[PDB]
Design a protein around this nucleic acid. Structure first.
Ligand SMILES: [Zn+2]
Lengths: 23, 62, 81, 717, 687, 225, 232
RNA sequence: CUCGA
């Protein structure tokens, strides 16, 4: 899942690299 | 001097124009464009400009 | 030897350049005759010495430039350079 | 024609609409007629149609680079709020449809409408006034559509089969209408090779001679052809009586046909023929299956093997730099030539792997749009990218845009991409500045005389002689020989003259001198035209736009200035070299020249370079002093060997270039004369534009040089 | 224009201004990309006009220290081992180390897979280097790009030129009536919409007590109530419609920091700059000729690309030399029919639809008797209308405007409202137009692929798929391989896979193309949303594999092939198109470049008082400028009379223009041009 | 190879979708027949739609009603989904009064004699305790798609809110043909027309209207000069 | 629905067997709907007669050259395919063509059995060499449209008989285009232009009238379903 | 000042 922090819609990411620091 | 003052170095041309007291014969494309005359080119030359058109004597009844 | 000229291409620009010496001379020929036709339509109801009317048969609501350009194509006018 | 919105025409023709609203008694007075147009009463839309009838309008798209940037059209009331432009005039305006705007101007006076109807009409300006080649021609979708149906496909369905066994010949149709019915049911393909009996197309002049010959082919006479159904449909578009062409319609083929149509067939035929090509091209481009998908982006098969071989050579040059055997300034140049050779091997690996059915190849190979270098960057590799310095980075972008660049690969790519956009604004500023300088210097150059009668002219290299024999066509024929007029009868080895003096050099009239053995002609030039102010028409030659002799009164100076200033947007020599020439500067090259013909006395050293020349007749030795950083030009020595590096003992002529570079045009005048320095400036400017893919006729460059040498200085009063 | 344009403008970094540099004093070196801009200023987002390089956008993760330099975060590598410890480094601090690229192959423990890795060094040097030399590494792949640049999916497949235009045109999107989130996304749309500040986020957790189109009330856990008011149909700075709409319903438990309502260009909290349109890549009868666009009339019938626009009109009643301007319904020589839409005060009423030329505010100004034309004084005598010493100066609708009057605001000095000295009344009228997509309106995508609407065919004319569903937009193929923006092709493929869904063959293990994909991606439902992060995201090997397993329609038939193409039918003839065509879904944005604004024409009108030449600009009802280059074109043609006509009677001939207008309404011929008044001014200035 | 008169037989899939097979047809003829029917179905099938509406508390589209969750614009967009048929062929008025709380649906509308609502479960608005919705709906009968009629062109006064009217009752039309290309004396095409409607009319009624449309239209070539 | 009136049909006669028809004005966008349908109805659904197979005496296993005539085999087949013919009998009808001696063969030198009619007796067929003789048998059948020669393989007997392409349709070439015409204020209304070139079996008038009758019957199959309302 | 070609 992508951006599971505010309660947003579940957009599925083609992510192979983890995000160490959030925007 | 009118075609030159509108190109480059406006003050440098106007100074030497008033010193030499040059008179400009308004016979050029750039000059006639400024003053509003027909440009002496294309349909503006005296060959095509001053032309009279008259119908041939063969005419219809009415 | 060509398709029928449609719209503003009639009369054909090729045949019009035959009765004239150059492109620029045809402009003055057609314009000054178009002014003659226009002065006839505006001085037909008043005044004598009205300019010579349209030489060819005009179409309904035809512009005087098109009428003058057709009679130039029909060899009904002269010139003076 | 052009389509302009109804709301635009109402306000543009507002006083004319008010006039007709009061004539037809839709309005009582002209005052209420104005309120009717302002309120847009429904009667005005029926009246406005009567007003704009055959009343031309002017369309303009800035920047107005050349005179075709403004063209006249017949207005057609269209709904909506956008201006509808013809697809063929898109090349003249340089107008794409990504948000562009155009201006409309309404000529009022009778003379102004006549100038738009005759001089400025889009259909009367098909050729480029700068080069004479057409502009309103199939250019993008249209050329691909015509390239489709005029393709010969072997295994295509409905093809011709020779008679074998019990069945006779398969694939021979009695009428093109039968071939159409065959393709309708689904038996024949429009691109299959068949034999068709034709009855309304003139056969090729090759085969028309053997069938008839004594008399021209007649509309109604029959003959067989081995074409495709589409090639027949293509030949129907061009006018009747035109020789059948069984070629594959590339853009070069179409441009050659239209150029021959403009030379032979009249104007209105060319305009209506290209309208047919437009409609037919769009129809078959729609049904040509041209599409871009990720599957159509084929990647090189040996992509890994090629890059690993050059990563090997790069690792060896990097190891040759670790031991200090290569200078740091030389390592970059060594790796540059390795990756330049690598991108050539990847590009060649794409040309052969890509089939000709693939739409990405069909687009580039048909002359539609795009390079193959774009397809290589698309599927193979981007290659060496440039940093804001200028030199290529020692590490290339190995990934393709189909594969996906890395973060650092993208970052280094933006360096050259941004500065590429950045300098384009400055280069266009200096271009338009040079353009308006060329306008003012030649604004008053008009054709005022028919013929100045001077037999003076200049020799043009029609063709270059080959050592074994026969002849080789000179590359400068298009820009220096065509559209010229003669000032001296061309004489071959026989006493007969092939072309008279004062004859416009057409396309066959050049082959007449080519097949006659003569390789040099003396032509009338605007340089030698001895007229008080303007130039005579006979020395000018053929008006490239009109395709005939220039009319008296045409401002050829402004046309010449626009013709040179329009392509100035794309340069590198380069643009500063063009400014070095037109401004008569002491150039950067500062190449020396031979002031007197004689014997070369090369006294070269290493501290400096000094060269003397013993005059071939009288005189005394003339000593020069030059820096050793230059190199001598390989001068065509009297030995007939052009690669004779100037050593002592060579026989150089007067005004001969010594070392490479750019000889000072100021000094060329005070050596060979005004006639020769004008020729030097003409083909030196032409070299800069030729070395970029721009074909400007020498006529226009000569109009400028004539204005540079009109003045002389006073030595003694 | 949209929330993204506002967020980008707040994060802009400008070199121009006091203390910086003059535009004339800036060479090609200040504007180009610098190697220290990595992760600090975006190398893509910048205008392409005269302000290129001088105006940049701050990178996503970048920040500013109290000194003034821009810091960017990095992952501290201890001994060739990636650590989750993150430290911000300045520009010169970054040069004192070497950093590894974000997409480096890393062990699950943290050790680099290759000894030599692509590493950036001081002075913009990229080279391989031992794993024991890497000091830091990048946080995210998108660390170098701006927020708008990080919103372009498959950005790694687009050249920097079209990528610049894609980010610059995303800020030009128009807020539509309804908004759709894109099927193909990047993940940035969520945080970009929330941080923009045009949505409504819940400050504290709680439940929804009362929800209306006017306001939302939240009952907190402690017991307090916070009510958020919705901004409804408010005009933005650029005439776009800023309209917020509630998302939650009555009695919905909502956490803190969650979007309870979203505004313009937002769908469920994500930036919705456009719509998902069914696209076919094929030439179509020349109507999409070099960058032209063909649209389905469905987008007009269903308000897909319909947007709301609001214009502000204003007029004031002042004190004049002969009295005071008064706003009144009584206007001289005007029928009761034009004044029918006005109230008793002379103001247009709310809800009345007004075309151009309609009266909005009826204001009359007293004119002196000594200021009358001889014909006007005779015309006043021959109509017997005395006591009409006032003239009409009412506020009328400008040319090209039409819509419903939605709001009125009146300010009066009589009613304690402080107006500037000399004013007695001020009225502001808000007019809203509902603009459907029209011929010539400028559409564009996210990859710099722009174009105007060339033709809107009927829904039956459009090439339709096998099941009769017609495509929405027909994009030309020729304008694809030139621009080097393959991202639009890859978006079209992934766009269809999101529209249809997919199911990977689970039997006999996971296939060899989907081994890198997360398990959440192996099965998808129709109309699923996905993220393609910049410099990460979907690879072509996985995209090719998804096209092979696209979900069937309701009838069970697979419309598109594994190549991504599908068989279309010509809606004008009926015969199917001879070859398969790439068909999918692409996110198209409506840019703020509409023909409704950009159309203009003028017969006559106002003239500049000094030069006596026509005014400039559409707002001033001015004429086009026949510039210097255009005069060269006239002379090159030899069109002398057209040139004389343009520079005299059609411009600044004071007496020529009036006699021409009379000659046209009389049907006479065009008179002879006189002397330009501008040339008279030149002589009087040389004197 | 001689003529056999073609036959048309209907097959039903759901209550608003039917397939129609027409055979035998000449080779290459099935695609053009299926198109000419699809073209006429998607455009010129008569139907009824709502011309304008009138909410009491509002005077234009760009406002809100107290207590309702949707603005007037969003309510109008939800009303664009309404499917309705009218027997009057003249302007006729529907009414809707509902007091919150609760959801207003298309079934909450009271249609006059002649017209009827075909999806009483469509969401229209959400009302709370303070919400009250009172709407008038003018329903005319036309064909195709007509934009909202202007208030300057119509005699409608300020309170009336015109809406775009989508009069077409057909939803989705397609076709496929099966060509018999076996090389022999007999070749023929079989056309399979697929028609889906929006419960306003049944699929065969729509095809019948397109049938009378094209019978009338192609009858112009039969008259001599 | 609503009334859509004033659609008219006018005819311009280019040649005696080729005319242009204009249907004007039609509603948008009915010009394209009935455009390709009228063309395919003309080209594929008009009953006509044409040659199905021929058999040349002296030609058995060669099919390369016919002795005694200048034309080879395929050239004979071509100008035989363009032979215009009409028949009142639906079943196939065999005709014979024979002429000896030096001279020229024509389609008038053929002997037509009762019921069939050769409409171009002056059509050249073959040039007869000195002391030349030509015997050939023709097979005429009724049909519609265009059928390839391969499907007529069964019509020929195993004795030097060759099948030919059968141009059953009386019309030869039909093209159509759609322009725009404004009836009142809107310019969206279409104008359909039909260009039909036909054989001398029937005039373009009757060919269009035949296509109209068959099309009204075709869509009459759908009209009979309910007989609902629709504006005329 | 900011943007469009
Ligand atoms: Zn001369």
């Amino acid at each position: 899942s992508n951006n599971s922090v505010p309660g947003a819609p579940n957009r599925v990411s083609f992510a192979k690299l983890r995000e160490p620091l959030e925007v | 001097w009118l075609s030159a003052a509108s190109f480059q170095e406006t003050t440098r041309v106007l100074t030497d124009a008033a010193i030499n007291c040059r008179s400009d014969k308004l016979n050029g494309l750039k000059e006639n464009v400024i003053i509003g005359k027909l440009i002496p080119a294309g349909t503006g030359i005296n060959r095509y400009r001053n032309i009279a058109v008259q119908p041939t004597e063969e005419a219809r009844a009415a | 030897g060509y398709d029928t000229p449609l719209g503003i291409t009639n009369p054909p620009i090729d045949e019009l350049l035959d009765r004239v010496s150059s492109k620029y001379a045809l402009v003055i020929y057609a314009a000054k005759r178009a002014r003659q036709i226009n002065d006839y339509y505006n001085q037909l109801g008043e005044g004598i010495l009205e300019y010579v009317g349209p030489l060819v048969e005009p179409g309904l609501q035809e512009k005087p430039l098109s009428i003058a350009l057709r009679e130039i194509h029909a060899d009904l006018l002269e010139h003076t350079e | 024609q052009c389509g302009l919105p109804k709301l635009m025409a109402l306000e543009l023709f507002k006083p004319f609409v008010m006039k007709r609203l009061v004539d037809l008694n839709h309005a009582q007075n002209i005052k209420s007629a104005k309120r009717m147009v302002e309120r847009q009463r429904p009667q005005v839309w029926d009246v406005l149609e009567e007003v704009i009838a055959e009343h031309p309008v002017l369309l303009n798209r800035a920047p107005t680079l050349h005179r075709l940037g403004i063209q006249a059209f017949e207005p057609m009331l269209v709904e909506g709020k956008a201006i509808q432009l013809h697809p063929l005039v898109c090349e003249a305006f340089n107008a794409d449809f990504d948000g562009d705007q155009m201006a409309v101007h309404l000529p009022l006076s009778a003379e102004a409408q006549a100038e738009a109807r005759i001089l400025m009409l889009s259909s009367n300006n098909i050729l480029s006034p700068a080069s004479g080649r057409p502009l309103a021609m199939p250019r993008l979708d249209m050329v691909t559509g015509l390239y489709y149906l005029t393709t010969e496909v072997p295994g295509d369905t409905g093809e011709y089969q020779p008679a074998s066994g019990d069945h006779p010949e398969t694939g021979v149709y009695s009428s093109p209408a039968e071939a159409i019915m065959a393709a309708d049911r689904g038996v024949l393909s429009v691109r299959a090779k068949i034999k068709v009996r034709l009855t309304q197309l003139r056969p090729p002049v090759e085969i028309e001679a053997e069938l008839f010959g004594h008399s021209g082919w007649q509309p109604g006479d029959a003959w067989m052809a081995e074409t495709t159904l589409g090639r027949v449909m293509f030949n129907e578009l061009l006018p009747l009586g035109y020789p059948f062409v069984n070629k594959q319609m590339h853009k070069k083929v179409q441009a050659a046909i239209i150029n021959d149509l403009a030379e032979r067939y009249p104007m209105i035929v060319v305009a209506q023929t290209v309208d047919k090509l437009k409609d037919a091209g769009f129809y078959w481009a729609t049904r040509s299956g041209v599409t871009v998908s990720m599957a159509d982006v084929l990647v090189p098969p040996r992509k890994k093997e090629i890059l690993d071989h050059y990563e090997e050579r790069a690792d060896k040059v990097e190891k040759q730099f670790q031991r200090g055997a290569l200078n740091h300034d030389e390592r970059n140049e060594a790796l540059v030539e390795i990756w330049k050779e690598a991108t050539d091997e990847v590009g060649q690996a794409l040309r052969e792997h890509y089939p000709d059915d693939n739409p990405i190849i069909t687009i580039v190979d048909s002359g539609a749009t795009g390079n193959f270098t774009q397809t290589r960057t698309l599927a193979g590799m981007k290659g060496l990218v440039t940093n804001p310095k200028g030199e290529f980075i020692p590490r290339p972008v190995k990934s393709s845009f189909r594969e996906g660049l890395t973060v650092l690969e993208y970052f280094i790519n933006t360096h050259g991409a941004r500065k590429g956009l950045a300098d384009t604004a400055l280069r266009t500023a200096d271009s338009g500045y040079l353009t308006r300088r060329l306008v003012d210097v030649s604004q008053d150059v008009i054709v005022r005389e028919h013929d100045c009668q001077t037999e003076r002219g200049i020799v043009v290299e029609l063709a270059e002689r080959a050592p074994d024999g026969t002849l080789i066509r000179d590359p400068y024929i298009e820009t220096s020989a065509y559209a010229r007029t003669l000032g001296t009868d061309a004489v071959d080895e026989a006493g007969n003259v092939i072309v008279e003096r004062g004859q416009d050099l057409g396309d066959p009239e050049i082959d007449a001198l080519l097949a006659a053995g003569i390789t040099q002609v003396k032509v009338r030039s605007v340089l030698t035209c001895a007229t008080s102010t303007g130039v005579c028409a006979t020395c000018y030659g053929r008006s490239m736009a009109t395709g005939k002799l220039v009319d008296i009164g045409e401002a050829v100076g402004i046309v010449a200035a626009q013709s040179i200033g329009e392509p100035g947007t794309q340069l590198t020599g380069g643009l500063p070299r063009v400014q070095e020439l037109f401004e008569a500067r002491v150039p950067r090259g500062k190449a020396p020249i031979a002031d007197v013909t004689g014997r070369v006395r090369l006294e070269d050293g290493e501290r400096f370079y000094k060269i003397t020349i013993v005059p071939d007749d009288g005189g005394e030795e003339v000593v020069y002093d030059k820096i050793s950083k230059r190199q001598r030009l390989r001068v065509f020595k009297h030995e007939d060997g052009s690669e004779r590096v100037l050593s002592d003992g060579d026989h150089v002529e007067v005004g001969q270039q010594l070392m490479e570079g750019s000889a000072d045009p100021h000094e060329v005048l005070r050596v060979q004369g005004p006639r020769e320095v004008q020729i030097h400036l003409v083909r030196e400017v032409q070299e800069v534009y030729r070395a970029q893919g721009v074909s400007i006729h020498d006529k226009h460059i000569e109009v400028i040089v004539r204005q540079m040498l009109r003045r002389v200085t006073i030595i003694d009063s | 224009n949209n929330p993204l344009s506002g967020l980008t403008h707040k994060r802009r970094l400008s070199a121009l201004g006091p203390g910086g540099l003059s535009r004339e004093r800036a060479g090609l070196e200040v504007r180009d990309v610098h190697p220290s801009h990595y992760g600090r200023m975006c190398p893509i987002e910048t205008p392409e006009g005269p302000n290129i390089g001088l105006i940049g956008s701050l990178s996503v993760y970048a920040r500013v220290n109290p000194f003034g330099f821009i810091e960017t975060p990095y992952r501290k590598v201890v001994d060739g081992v990636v650590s989750d410890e993150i430290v911000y480094l300045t520009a010169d601090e970054e040069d004192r180390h070497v950093v590894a690229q974000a997409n480096s192959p890393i062990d699950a423990d943290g050790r680099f897979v290759e000894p030599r890795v692509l590493v950036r060094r001081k002075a913009g040097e990229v080279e391989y280097v031992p794993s024991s030399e890497v000091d830091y590494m990048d946080v995210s792949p998108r660390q170098m790009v701006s927020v708008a640049t990080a919103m372009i999916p498959f950005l790694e497949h687009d050249d920097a030129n079209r990528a610049l235009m894609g980010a610059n045109m995303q800020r030009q999107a128009v807020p539509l009536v309804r908004s759709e989130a894109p099927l193909v996304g990047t993940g940035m749309e969520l945080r970009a919409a929330i941080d923009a500040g045009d949505v409504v986020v819940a400050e504290e957790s709680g439940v929804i007590e009362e929800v209306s189109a006017d306001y939302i009330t939240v009952m907190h856990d402690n017991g307090t109530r916070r009510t958020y008011r919705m901004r409804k149909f408010a005009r933005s700075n650029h005439g776009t419609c800023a309209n917020q709409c509630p998302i939650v319903d009555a009695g919905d438990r909502v956490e803190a920091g969650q979007v309870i309502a979203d505004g313009p260009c937002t769908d469920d909290g994500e930036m919705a700059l456009g719509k998902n349109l069914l696209v076919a890549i094929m030439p179509w009868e020349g109507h999409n000729y070099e960058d032209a666009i063909i649209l389905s009339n469905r987008l007009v019938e269903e308000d897909v690309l319909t947007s709301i626009h609001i214009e502000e009109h204003e007029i004031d009643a002042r004190d004049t030399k002969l009295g005071a301007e008064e706003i009144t319904r009584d206007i001289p020589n005007i029928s009761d029919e034009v004044l029918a839409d006005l109230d008793e005060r002379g103001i247009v009423r709310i809800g009345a639809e007004v075309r151009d030329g309609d009266i909005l505010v009826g204001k009359v100004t007293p004119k002196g008797e000594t200021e009358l034309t001889p014909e006007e004084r005779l015309l006043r005598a021959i109509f017997g209308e005395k006591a009409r010493e006032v003239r009409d100066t009412s506020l009328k609708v400008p040319h090209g405007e039409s819509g419903k009057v939605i709001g009125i605001r009146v300010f009066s000095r009589e009613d304690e409202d402080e107006l500037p000295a000399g004013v007695n009344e001020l009225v502001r009228v808000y007019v809203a137009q509902k603009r459907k997509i029209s011929d010539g309106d400028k559409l564009a995508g996210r990859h710099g692929n722009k174009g105007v609407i060339g033709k809107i065919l009927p829904v039956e004319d459009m090439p339709f798929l096998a099941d009769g569903t017609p495509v929405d937009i027909i994009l030309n193929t020729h304008g694809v391989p030139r621009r080097m923006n393959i991202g639009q092709i890859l978006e079209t493929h992934l766009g269809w896979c999101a529209h249809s869904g997919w199911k990977v063959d689970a039997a006999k293990g996971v296939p060899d193309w989907a081994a890198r994909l997360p398990d959440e991606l192996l099965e998808a439902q129709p109309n699923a949303i996905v993220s393609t992060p910049v410099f990460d995201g979907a690879q072509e090997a996985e995209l090719q594999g998804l096209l092979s397993c696209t979900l069937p329609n309701r009838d069970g038939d697979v419309l598109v092939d594994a190549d991504g193409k599908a068989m279309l039918f010509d809606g004008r003839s009926g015969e199917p198109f001879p070859y398969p065509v790439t068909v999918g879904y692409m996110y198209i944005m409506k840019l703020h470049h509409l023909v409704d604004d950009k159309i203009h024409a003028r017969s006559t009108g106002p003239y500049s008082m000094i030069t006596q030449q026509p005014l400039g600009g559409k707002a001033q009802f001015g004429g086009q400028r026949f510039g210097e280059m255009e005069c060269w074109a006239m002379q090159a043609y030899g069109a002398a009379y057209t040139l004389q006509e343009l520079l005299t009677i059609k411009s600044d001939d004071t007496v020529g223009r009036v006699k021409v207008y009379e000659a046209i309404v009389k049907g006479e011929n065009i008179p002879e041009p006189g002397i330009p008044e501008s040339f008279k001014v030149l002589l009087k200035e040389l004197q | 190879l001689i003529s056999q008169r073609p036959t048309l037989s209907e097959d039903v899939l759901t209550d608003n979708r039917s397939q129609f097979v027409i055979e035998p047809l000449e080779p290459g003829f099935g695609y053009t027949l299926g198109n000419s029917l699809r073209r006429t179905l998607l455009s010129s099938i008569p139907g009824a739609a709502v011309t304008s509406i009138r909410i009491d508390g509002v005077l234009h589209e760009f406002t809100t009603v107290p207590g309702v969750k949707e603005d007037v614009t969003e309510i109008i967009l939800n009303l664009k989904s309404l499917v309705v048929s009218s027997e009057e062929d003249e302007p006729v008025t529907m009414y809707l009064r509902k007091q919150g709380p609760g959801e207003v649906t298309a079934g909450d509308i009271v249609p006059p004699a002649g017209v009827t609502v075909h999806n009483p479960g469509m969401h229209i608005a959400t009302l709370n305790d303070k919400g009250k919705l009172e709407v008038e709906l003018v329903v005319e009968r036309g064909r195709g798609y007509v934009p909202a009629v202007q208030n300057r062109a119509s005699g409608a006064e300020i309170g009336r809110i015109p809406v775009d009217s989508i009069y077409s009752p057909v939803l989705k039309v397609t076709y496929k043909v099966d060509a018999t290309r076996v090389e022999q004396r007999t070749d023929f095409d079989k056309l399979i027309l697929d028609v889906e409607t929006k419960n306003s009319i049944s699929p065969r009624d729509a095809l019948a209207s397109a049938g009378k449309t094209l019978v009338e239209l192609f009858g112009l070539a039969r008259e001599l000069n």
